[PDB]
């Protein structure tokens, strides 16, 4: 048993026709102390996997280490080790959500919310949900911490169940992806306006986007808002 | 506890105040805070003083040892090594540590590590309960590739004003100068920084 | 309890008060709390009493030991290395609190360690409930390059002000002088200024007063021959 | 000779008899053939029965849905260390969500028999086993020894007289290699391999034993009546 | 007769397994020799490199145990870098433990104890090899202490070993025994290691050029060995006189 | 790995003879000659320091032994396993009574201790026993001085005078001729000096001898003053040029 | 609840000319019930004494492990413990309980066979010693007993003019305690006699 | 459990133990045998935690009746009590404490004397002519501190104990179910079946 | 006698007769080099083709530690197998503690103390491996030979197995004529012509050519096998020369 100190919040992502998109922002916060703001959240695994976490950034960086070890354990006396034996995006969830029930089994847990997005092999898209208490999901849209109340609601207007995921293009999913981190802007204490952004495509691969701003900021309107009665 | 460490053109710089509390008593008011683990590789000590004291034994004697075995480690690997007893036992421990160290290679390089155990890389760092009043500063000040003399005016300017604020820092301002020159011992008396 | 260590010239003195106490209760007049870790380490504990006596007598012994092995003389670094160890693994659980001071090969040296395994360095050191009665004094009087004589006079002022002004602490004062070059000179009760002033009566009782059920000789003696 | 009483000792040569003695075993057991197209991978085996009284001793274990081995030697070794591989395809699955890759439980199969070949108190496994499977590369064939080698082969035969079934499998290579969907001639092909390596004793319908696994066929192992059709 | 094979007592009382170890000491055919000066001690062993498919960088048997200990060692490298990752691992727990540098005579006893156990203990062998540990020590000054698979050690004036020791050992005494000083009553290391090479060449009757010798120095403070280019240097004055 | 030699590898042969504790004894026997002589007021430890090299200097190798203040130890036989029982017994002295009584213990349980290690030498799995006999002086309040001889297999003996190793036959008969109960200090020195050049084939001096008492308490040699109970060490090691004093009154 | 104070009772010790005396009350109680007067709470192992107040079944268990190792000291020293010995083996022996401890207030009285020196020492319950050159209480009237010693005692006492000074401190201070009392004992102790003598007091 | 007296007369010790079984609501049995025997000449009776009070008291007879059987021979009352003492002794300091205290009453075979030791769960033993555990102390310890004498009768010794028992069912609020009354003397162990 | 019946146990010369027994097995083995260049070093072995029915570039011999070592060996091929798990052990607790990936002096230490420690107890048999590794780091390349013993130097070029001979001779004329140093694409082809050359010795049954390489400039100091193209414009020169 512990408490967070240093943390991260919301993590969000959602599927497309193609593929699959996942963003978070780049803060680590020490309470309400805004402490350090260059902290990558989004951590790539090959050219087919990204791993999104939220919570503790101490615990954040000893799974970025555990999956940076799983990639030279995979490579080992493995021919096909870039081929037909790389790492799934199914393998490193698995891998996570397995270690993820185990810490809480032994009442250590590691304090975080962890979204695996990314594409299989026969080009299926994946995106699945593991947190501190091992619990498992998945959903067309799936959010963490102050996403889930906020994002979630906006994303699934673009994709409400399973057969809107063919008729969503990858410009509309990127530009509902981006709209929904600059409403956690406004609403969330502990965000920042940096951000980064990964989408994970079935024909063009992965695209890393770092140092994205949150940009078109409606706040023109409070210069008449005065009092409170 | 008031602490920093600066990162400049000709490598980096740690800063510390020198007063221990033990509630509203100062039961040591010329403490030196700036522990050496290796030749020029030093850290600011926060939090706990027995954890701390502790922990930077046992880097200073596994740096020892990998010296003996691999020459002369690299920051990172101290920073790493002051991580590992920070991250694994954070149950047991309230340590609030910055790694502060000078390769040729790599050149000035700082490290914190806050309560979690967590690393990060940067610039500069600043930490102990004093810190909290010279965000502002710090942030507003703070340049990339000072000179010697404007970084020891910096960090003189910056604890300065976390010791006016902060009753759990005081006492005189310690330096240590990291570089390729060598290693410099610098001390501020009240009388000096109290009138900037 | 009351306290003190003042480095000077040649060497460094240690200075405590000589009262034990159960709660406000004094339970010893004449306690001895300067311990000798070894011939020219000593160090004078505050806190809990038998953890003080109990971690000096371990790392005393201990220090002997590694002292034939090295068939070196033992040194104050290596005793405060050991002592914090030790306190440190039991995380404040042995509730000693120390001033360290001693001569050796390397020169004159002077610590405080506190239980739950930090030290520190100082020219002057306080411990005890009189602790700041003490600093007062040490804080007033201390100046660099003090002579034998000025540190011996400064140390028992200050264990005075302790005794005088703080109630944990009381009677006499013990002095442990150790110069470097030189035997370290144990001065027990220094100073005696709470003597008992004579009663107003004697209370001897005539032969006979107490009232007696049964007497009989106690065998103290083993099994007799024959 | 002086060297050959434990495992820790190397004869002046540089030799392990123990090693060898056990290798000793594999060859006194019956007699089983491996061989794979693209597609499917096939083990055929001969059971051998203690008299007219008795069963025919088993020889081929499942050790998942997409792998198993036959045996030859030792029949309880071969139960430890198929158990070791059911443990391992097991693990892959349950943490990884990942079906074991033949090639890796081949490396397994191996440092597991080298600990017994090193070390005081121990002993060699006194068993050989041909190990199949299909996995995201395809038909895969497997032969493991005691002195923890193991090689990966189109087709190969163990236990005693396989060398006949082995020449066989080495002239044949160009035709059995392209078989493609079409498992009872795969079959039909190991069963002639086998037949290569018969003496006085001819396959009955309790005597043969075979197994398959490939594309669109989970390991499944064939007995009694089963095999009157391959007769 | 497994007496012989594992260290208990024949019947004369030896114990022939530690015997043996001390015949596989001379197994690499190379020689060392250590002197001290006023202010240092100087190490030096011959260097051979006879495959030209060797990096001769990687060729040595001179250990930098701590930053105030160096070693020489007499015996094959697979035991020498045993006990010189043992004798770092020791030398690294005593300064934490007792917070000042463990002294080259202490270590060399602790070696020694080590090396006693395998004579004692059945199931353990002894190490093939002779340690001579040098340092200049804060309270004894230039210490040279030796130590052998039997776990005997003592301090040293000098000392030589490998092969052809009792030539050097003999060629230094004759020296001091003129002098009538326990050292080379030299200011400079540099002049030290010269006369290091110069004794060396006289009592082996060869000539050294700069891949031919290996060459530890200790001062206050530090061991180092030197490169190829310091030897060269020290060579060169002593051809010039 | 793992220590496989769980099992005695000292066993009693047909004839009752436990073999290795012989050879152990043989091993002692071919060791340098030591000595120790009881008096009325002290007890004097001597051996010779034979040197392997002239370069080694000797004094760095100390054949006579501080145990406790007030106890000493020489030996006869193999050096390196003297080295590690004279670490242990300096442990157990603090392990097994000074932590417990908070004094050192006396003579004679030392003693007791030190032989039950050497004893457990000789029974427990996969060791040999140590190669040395140890001749052991000292004093304590309630036995007044003593000296006890400590063998390979554990046995222990209380001594007036007595000597170990190479010419101890010899020497035992040339004590038998000099000790009586009166003798002071300074008598048995001199026998003791007289005893040992016998044996003795080269230099004879205070750089080759090594002796040791147990006499009067040293309060110059404590360390510090201000407790009148604590008056030093009994044990002291005589210096070079008191040895060569005392060979100009021989 | 609290340990120490469950079956009450009380431990006095002084010194005089050439003599000590050691002093105990006989109750032994469950709280408020008085369940035993003829509970001794001064045991000797040769010359040397030794009181001990506070838990009944920790007295007991202690007074059998005292006994225990003073014979096997016995047997291997080939002589008695003396009084400063064995204050070291009860400071030793209670401190090996550190952190789990014997809940007891002992007292060490005796005569130095060797030196004549009178001796007497006490403990906490985790094995810190006091050595007072006068006096040494212990128990649940400790207080009172302080009070009593402080003012009655003077140096030098014969040992009948002892025995009236430490009978009145033990009865007195007894007589302020609800947990002590219930009868008491006086051991008068010379180099070699000892004598004891029961005492007659109030029965409440 | 509740009541247990014990009193030792000239010739015997006598012990009473309530026949009472009480979970929580409902009395489940009001013919309960708290005793046992742990050699011909020695009896223990028991009271304390539900089930610890048995588990303890069988484990100190089969230790008692192993020793008897390897010696040949029954120990001393004083004996089998400081056994006893030592176990729960050792157990106040275990993970789990045995709550059980014990009242044993033997008949010394050797000296011809009856004894009555009482220990508590702590290790608390002393040597008593009468006692009890609990608050039976508290109701009875006055009437036998006025009427009992060391050269009583075993009559005598039961009609004084009669005496408690009535003042025990006068003044107690918990009906515990009358006594069973058991005598140990030279003749070794008896039930006094009509009480 | 009788000293050779045990690991551990000196012999009256002071020999371990068990680790040169050892040594033995190594010699039986195929042939596997090793060759340091410019910027890095170059791995190739013998592969001994004993059937038409072995898969051909399936069995794979060469083996990479963390991502910047490769290891080969010759003799009991398990008890390499054995070493390198060892080995891949001790490269995960360095970079666990120290962040940095294990410098290859420093690794090579790791497998020299685990091999020499086979050697001091009778409980267990020495490796029967000669084991060439090496990589980049931050220090440049490195290349290491170790034996059954422990023992283990630095090496410009290296060999081991049975024809050990006649590849030195071959690396020792590599090192003659090019003292600048040698491109990681020139060691690539000598590679192939040296284990091609080395085959003699192993000539009643052909074999399989396996290369494998760490280079700064054209690996990114990680390590890779060479395949394709690169491989058979190996094999094209190898053949080559010894026509
Ligand atoms: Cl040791
Ligand atoms: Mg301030
Ligand atoms: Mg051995
Ligand atoms: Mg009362
Ligand atoms: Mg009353």
């Given at each position: ?12 992502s959602?599927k497309?026709d193609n593929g699959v998109?996942i ?19 989004l951590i790539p695994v090959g050219d087919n996997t990204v791993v999104g976490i ?8 000893h799974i970025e280490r555990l999956l940076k070890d799983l990639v030279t354990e995979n490579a080992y006396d493995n021919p096909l080790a870039d081929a037909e034996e790389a790492l799934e995006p199914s393998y490193i969830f698995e891998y996570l959500a397995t270690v993820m029930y185990q810490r809480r089994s032994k009442?250590?847990?590691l304090?975080n919310?962890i979204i695996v997005a990314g594409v299989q092999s026969n080009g299926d898209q994946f995106l699945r949900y593991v947190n501190?208490?091992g619990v498992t999901y998945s959903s067309?849209?799936l ?19 399973e057969?809107?995921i ?32 990964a989408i994970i495509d079935k024909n063009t691969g992965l695209t890393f ?21 | ?196 | ?226 | 000779?002086?060297?050959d009483?434990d495992t820790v000792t190397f004869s002046?040569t540089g030799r392990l008899f123990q090693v060898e003695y056990a290798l000793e075993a594999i060859k006194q057991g019956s007699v089983t053939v491996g061989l794979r197209s693209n597609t499917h991978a096939v083990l055929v085996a001969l059971k051998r029965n203690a008299?007219?009284?008795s069963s025919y001793q088993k020889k081929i274990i499942k050790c998942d849905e997409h792998m198993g081995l036959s045996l030859a030697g030792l029949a309880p070794d071969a139960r430890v260390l198929s158990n070791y591989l059911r443990q391992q395809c097991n693990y892959s699955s349950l943490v990884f969500n990942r079906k074991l890759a033949v090639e890796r439980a081949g490396h397994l199969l191996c440092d597991k028999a080298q600990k017994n070949t090193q070390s005081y108190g121990g002993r060699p496994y006194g068993v050989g086993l041909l190990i199949i499977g299909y996995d995201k590369s395809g038909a895969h064939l497997l032969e493991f020894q005691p002195s923890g080698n193991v090689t990966e082969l189109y087709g190969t035969a163990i236990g005693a007289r396989s060398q006949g079934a082995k020449t066989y499998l080495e002239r044949t290579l160009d035709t059995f290699i392209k078989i493609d969907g079409n498992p009872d001639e795969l079959i039909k092909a190991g069963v002639e391999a086998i037949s290569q390596s018969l003496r006085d004793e001819s396959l009955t319908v309790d005597n043969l034993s075979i197994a398959i696994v490939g594309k669109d066929t989970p390991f499944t192992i064939y007995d009694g009546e089963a095999v009157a059709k391959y007769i | ?241 | 790995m793992t ?248 | ?204 | ?195 | ?20 027994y050892a040594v033995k097995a190594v010699e039986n083995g195929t042939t596997s080099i090793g060759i340091?260049c410019?910027?890095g070093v170059v791995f190739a072995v013998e592969k001994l083709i004993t059937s038409k029915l072995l898969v051909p570039q399936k069995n794979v011999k060469i083996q990479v530690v963390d991502r910047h070592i490769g290891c080969v060996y010759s003799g009991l091929i398990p008890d390499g197998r054995h070493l390198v798990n060892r080995g891949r052990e001790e490269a995960a607790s360095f970079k666990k503690l120290?962040?940095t990936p294990i410098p290859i002096?420093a690794f090579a230490?790791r497998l020299g103390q685990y091999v020499?420690a086979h050697?001091?107890?009778?409980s267990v048999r020495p490796f029967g491996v000669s084991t060439i590794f090496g990589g980049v780091d931050?220090?440049?390349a490195h290349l290491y030979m170790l034996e059954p013993?422990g023992?283990y ?5 290296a060999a081991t197995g049975k024809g050990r001979?006649?590849a ?16 990681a694409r020139?060691a690539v082809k000598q590679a192939a012509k040296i284990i091609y050359l080395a085959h003699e010795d192993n000539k009643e049954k052909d074999f399989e050519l396996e290369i494998s390489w760490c280079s700064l400039?054209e690996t990114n100091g990680l390590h890779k096998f060479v395949k394709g193209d690169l491989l058979q414009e190996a094999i094209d020169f190898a053949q080559?020369?010894?026509?």
């Open positions: 048993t512990q408490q967070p100190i240093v943390t991260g919040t919301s993590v969000i959602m497309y998109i963003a978070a922002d780049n803060l680590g916060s020490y309470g309400s102390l805004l402490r350090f703001n260059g902290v990558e959240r939220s919570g503790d950034i101490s615990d954040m960086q009442m250590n847990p304090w919310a501190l208490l067309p849209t959010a963490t911490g102050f996403g889930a109340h906020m994002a979630n609601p906006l994303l699934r207007k673009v994709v409400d169940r057969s809107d063919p008729k969503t293009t990858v410009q509309v999913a990127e530009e509902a992806i981006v709209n929904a981190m600059r409403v956690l802007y406004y609403r969330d204490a502990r965000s920042s306006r940096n951000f980064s952004l986007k770092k140092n994205l701003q949150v940009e078109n900021m409606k706040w023109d309107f409070a210069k008449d808002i005065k009092g409170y009665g | 506890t008031s602490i920093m460490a600066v990162t400049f053109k000709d490598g980096v710089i740690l800063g510390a105040d020198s007063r221990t509390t033990t509630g509203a008593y100062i039961a040591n008011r010329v403490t030196d805070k700036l522990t050496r683990v290796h030749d020029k590789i030093w850290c600011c000590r926060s939090g706990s003083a027995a954890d701390t004291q502790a922990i930077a034994d046992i880097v200073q004697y596994h740096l020892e040892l990998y010296t003996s075995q691999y020459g002369t480690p690299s920051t990172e690997t101290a920073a790493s090594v002051f991580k590992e007893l920070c991250y694994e036992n954070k149950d047991n421990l309230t340590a609030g540590i910055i790694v502060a160290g000078y390769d040729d290679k790599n050149k000035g390089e700082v490290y914190t590590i806050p309560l979690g155990g967590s690393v990060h890389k940067l610039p500069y760092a600043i930490a102990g309960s004093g810190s909290t009043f010279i965000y502002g500063y710090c942030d507003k000040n703070f340049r990339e590739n000072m000179s010697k003399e404007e970084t020891v005016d910096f960090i003189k300017h910056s604890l300065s004003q976390a010791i006016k604020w902060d009753g759990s820092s005081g006492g005189v301002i310690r330096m240590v100068v990291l570089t390729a020159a060598g290693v410099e011992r610098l001390i501020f008396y009240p009388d000096e920084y109290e009138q900037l | 309890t009351t306290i003190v260590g003042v480095k000077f010239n040649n060497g460094v003195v240690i200075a405590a008060d000589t009262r034990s106490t159960q709660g406000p209760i004094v339970a010893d007049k004449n306690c001895a709390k300067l311990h000798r870790i070894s011939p020219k380490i000593w160090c004078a504990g505050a806190g809990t009493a038998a953890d003080t006596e109990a971690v000096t007598q371990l790392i005393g012994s201990n220090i002997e030991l590694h002292s034939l092995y090295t068939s070196r003389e033992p040194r104050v670094v290596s005793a405060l290395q050991m002592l914090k160890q030790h306190l440190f693994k039991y995380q404040g659980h042995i509730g000693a609190y120390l001033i360290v001071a001693g001569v050796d090969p390397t020169g004159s040296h002077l610590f405080s360690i506190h239980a739950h395994g930090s030290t520190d360095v100082g020219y002057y050191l306080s411990l005890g409930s009189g602790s700041l009665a003490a600093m007062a004094v040490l804080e007033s009087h201390w100046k660099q390059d003090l002579t034998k004589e000025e540190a011996i006079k400064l140390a028992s002022d200050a264990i005075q002000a302790g005794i005088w002004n703080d109630l944990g602490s009381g009677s006499n004062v013990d002095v442990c002088v150790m110069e470097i070059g030189k035997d370290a000179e144990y001065l027990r009760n220094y100073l005696t200024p709470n003597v008992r002033e004579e009663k107003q009566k004697s209370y001897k009782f005539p032969r006979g007063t107490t009232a007696v059920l049964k007497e009989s000789i106690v065998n103290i003696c083993d099994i007799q021959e024959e | 000779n002086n060297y009483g002046p008299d007219e009284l | 007769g497994y007496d012989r094979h594992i260290t208990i007592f024949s019947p004369e009382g030896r114990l022939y397994q530690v015997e043996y170890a001390f015949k596989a000491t001379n197994q690499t055919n190379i020689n060392s020799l250590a002197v001290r000066g006023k202010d240092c001690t100087v190490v030096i062993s011959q260097k051979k490199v006879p495959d030209k498919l060797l990096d001769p960088t990687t060729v040595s048997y001179i250990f930098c145990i701590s930053r105030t200990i160096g070693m020489v060692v007499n015996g094959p490298i697979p035991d020498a870098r045993n006990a010189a990752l043992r004798a770092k691992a020791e030398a690294a727990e005593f300064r934490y433990k007792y917070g000042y540098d463990m002294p080259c005579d202490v270590l060399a006893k602790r070696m020694a104890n080590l090396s006693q156990i395998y004579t004692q203990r059945a199931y353990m062998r002894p190490l093939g090899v002779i340690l001579t540990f040098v340092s200049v020590d804060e309270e004894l000054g230039p210490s040279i202490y030796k130590t052998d698979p039997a776990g005997y050690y003592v301090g040293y004036k000098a000392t030589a070993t490998g092969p052809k020791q009792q030539e050097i050992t003999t060629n230094l005494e004759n020296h001091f025994k003129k002098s009538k000083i326990d050292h080379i009553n030299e200011e400079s290391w540099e002049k030290v290691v010269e006369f290091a090479i110069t004794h060396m060449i006289d009592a082996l009757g060869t000539e050294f050029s700069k891949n031919d010798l290996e060459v530890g120095v200790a001062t206050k403070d530090k061991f180092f060995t030197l490169s190829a280019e310091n030897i060269e240097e020290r060579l060169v004055a002593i051809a010039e006189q | 220590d496989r030699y769980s099992f005695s590898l000292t066993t009693f042969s047909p004839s009752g003879k436990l073999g290795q504790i012989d050879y152990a004894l043989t091993a002692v026997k071919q060791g340098v000659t030591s000595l120790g002589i009881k008096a009325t007021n002290g007890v004097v430890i001597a051996t010779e320091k034979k040197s392997s090299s002239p370069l080694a200097m000797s004094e760095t190798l100390s054949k006579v032994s501080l145990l406790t203040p007030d106890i000493g130890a020489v030996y006869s036989g193999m050096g390196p396993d003297y080295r590690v029982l004279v670490d242990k017994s300096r442990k157990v002295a603090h392990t097994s009574y000074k932590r417990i009584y908070g004094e050192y213990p006396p003579t004679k349980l030392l003693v007791s201790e030190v032989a039950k290690i050497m004893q457990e030498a000789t029974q427990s799995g996969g060791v040999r026993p140590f190669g040395v006999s140890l001749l052991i002086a000292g004093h304590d309040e309630f036995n007044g001085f003593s000296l006890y001889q400590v063998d390979p297999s554990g046995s222990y003996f209380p001594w007036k005078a007595t000597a170990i190793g190479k010419g101890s036959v010899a020497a035992k008969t040339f004590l038998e001729k000099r000790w009586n109960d009166e003798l002071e200090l300074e008598d048995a020195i001199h026998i003791a000096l007289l005893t040992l050049k016998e044996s003795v084939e080269g230099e004879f001096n205070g750089d080759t001898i090594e002796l040791a008492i147990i006499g009067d308490e040293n309060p110059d040699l404590l360390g510090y003053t201000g407790i009148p109970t604590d008056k030093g060490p009994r044990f002291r090691k005589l210096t070079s040029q008191e040895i060569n004093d005392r060979l100009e009154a021989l | 609840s609290d340990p120490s104070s469950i079956n009450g009772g009380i431990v006095v010790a002084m010194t005089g000319k050439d003599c000590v005396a050691i002093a105990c009350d006989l109750r032994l109680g469950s709280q408020s019930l008085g369940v035993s007067n003829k509970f001794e709470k001064i045991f000797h192992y040769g010359h040397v004494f030794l009181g001990i107040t506070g838990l009944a079944t920790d007295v007991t268990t202690l007074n059998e492990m005292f006994r225990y190792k003073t014979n096997l000291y016995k047997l291997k020293e080939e002589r008695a413990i003396e009084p400063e010995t064995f204050t070291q083996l009860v400071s030793s022996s209670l401190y090996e309980r550190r952190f789990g401890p014997y809940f007891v207030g002992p007292v060490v009285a005796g005569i130095n066979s060797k030196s004549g020196k009178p001796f007497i020492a006490g403990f906490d319950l985790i094995g810190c010693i006091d050595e007072a050159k006068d006096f040494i209480v212990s128990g649940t009237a400790s207080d009172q007993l302080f009070g009593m010693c402080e003012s009655l005692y003077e140096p030098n006492l014969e040992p009948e003019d002892l025995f009236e000074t430490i009978s009145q401190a033990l009865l007195n201070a007894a007589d302020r305690d609800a947990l002590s009392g219930w009868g008491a004992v006086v051991y008068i102790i010379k180099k070699d006699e000892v004598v004891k003598r029961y005492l007659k007091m109030r029965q409440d | 459990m509740d009541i247990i007296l014990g009193i030792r007369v000239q010739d015997s010790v006598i012990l009473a133990s309530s026949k009472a079984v009480t979970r929580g609501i409902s009395v489940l049995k009001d013919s309960d045998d708290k005793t046992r025997q742990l050699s011909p000449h020695t009896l223990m009776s028991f009271a304390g935690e539900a089930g610890d009070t048995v588990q303890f008291a069988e484990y100190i007879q089969a230790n008692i009746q192993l020793y008897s059987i390897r010696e040949d021979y029954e120990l001393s009352p004083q004996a089998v009590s400081s056994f006893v003492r030592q176990e729960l002794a050792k157990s106040i300091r275990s993970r789990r404490p045995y709550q059980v205290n014990v009242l044993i009453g033997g008949y010394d075979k050797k000296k011809n004397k009856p004894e009555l030791y009482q220990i508590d769960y702590l290790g608390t033993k002393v040597e008593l002519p009468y006692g009890a555990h609990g608050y039976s102390g508290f109701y009875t310890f006055s009437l036998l501190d006025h009427h009992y004498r060391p050269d009583m009768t075993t009559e005598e010794g039961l009609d004084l104990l009669k005496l408690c028992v009535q003042e025990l069912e006068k003044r107690m609020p918990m009906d515990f179910k009358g006594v069973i009354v058991k005598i140990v003397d030279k003749d070794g162990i008896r039930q006094v079946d009509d009480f | 006698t009788g000293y050779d019946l045990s690991n551990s146990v000196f012999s009256p010369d002071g020999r371990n007769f068990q680790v040169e340091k410019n910027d120290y962040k002096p230490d020499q050697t001091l107890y009778n931050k220090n440049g013993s023992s130097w630095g090496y410009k070029g001979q006649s030195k001779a071959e690396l020792e004329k590599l090192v003659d004529h090019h003292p600048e140093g040698l491109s020139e400039s080559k020369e010894i026509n």
